[PDB]
Symmetry: C3
């Protein structure tokens, strides 16, 4: 009463501003951390996708060859005894593309600097 | 002193409210972006999991068959010459289920609209 | 005018503080949710990586063996008729490590409790 109300409000503002700005920084860090983590997942997921496809590609080739050789062999035996397998090329791994979301997270982190609070200070309390 | 303290506090409130609301919108965007990115990762990861399992399934079948045919062949040769391989069915890819976390991110984004600040305006300064 | 300005400012502060604190809690929840989701993705992605590698390992072994057996067979036939395949060991799935980002998200969530606003109350309005 004696003259504190005006002073408590200002102190409250300084806290509000300090706590908010503190939180923003924490949030920016979390965003960058999420984008970084999302980016690593994308790399691994895609590299593993391409590994699986590269494999299917070779395997298909192998079974085509194996079935061919066994056929030749069986054939010979026939002649000798006379004288005397599913393809997997369709299996495909897809890749993910979240680069746009990753870039968006970094932009938002950078832009939160524009949402910080620059409290007008009252000398009479500073 | 002349009569500004009451006016600086209000201006500070308008900034606090404008900057916070601005940040909330930015954060909502980041959440939706994260959920969208998480959702795409889940789809690809699971589709690649199922591709790998579908493959193991066929491959096991193939090696069972190949070993069988080679055995028959070797057998014949025996008769002809007389007259004259690990299974992989156990390899399994697991799938992930983060749908609940994805839905939770979208709900939080929607609910932050309920955390916006509607500052009571003082006509004497408006 | 009669004496409300001082009272509207305080009411505005209570709202600012209530809405911010409410948002912080919402954000903490979103962070924990993101970390939990990121953690599940890491587990599945890595487990699927290791499954793919375990498979390549066995497959390479299988084709080495198959080519060997077919060679022996073809060889015999030669003798009998006389008397009468790419390796994939190089395909490798990589694993991801975002544990550090996951732990960082949880720390930030825990630390936001230190960014909450504890508004100094003015009895004259309470
Ligand atoms: Cl305020
Ligand atoms: Cl994967």
């Amino acid at each position: 009463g004696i003259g504190v109300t005006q002073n408590v409000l200002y102190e409250n503002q300084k806290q509000i501003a300090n706590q908010f700005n503190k939180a923003i920084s924490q949030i920016q860090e979390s965003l960058t951390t999420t984008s970084t983590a999302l980016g690593k997942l994308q790399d691994v997921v895609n590299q593993n996708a391409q590994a699986l496809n590269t494999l299917v590609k070779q395997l298909s080739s192998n079974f085509g060859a194996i079935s061919s050789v066994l056929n030749d062999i069986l054939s010979r035996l026939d002649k000798v005894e006379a004288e005397v397998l599913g393809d997997i090329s369709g299996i495909n791994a897809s890749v993910v593309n979240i680069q746009k979301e990753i870039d968006r997270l970094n932009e938002v982190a950078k832009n939160l600097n524009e949402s910080l609070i620059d409290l007008q200070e009252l000398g009479k309390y500073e």
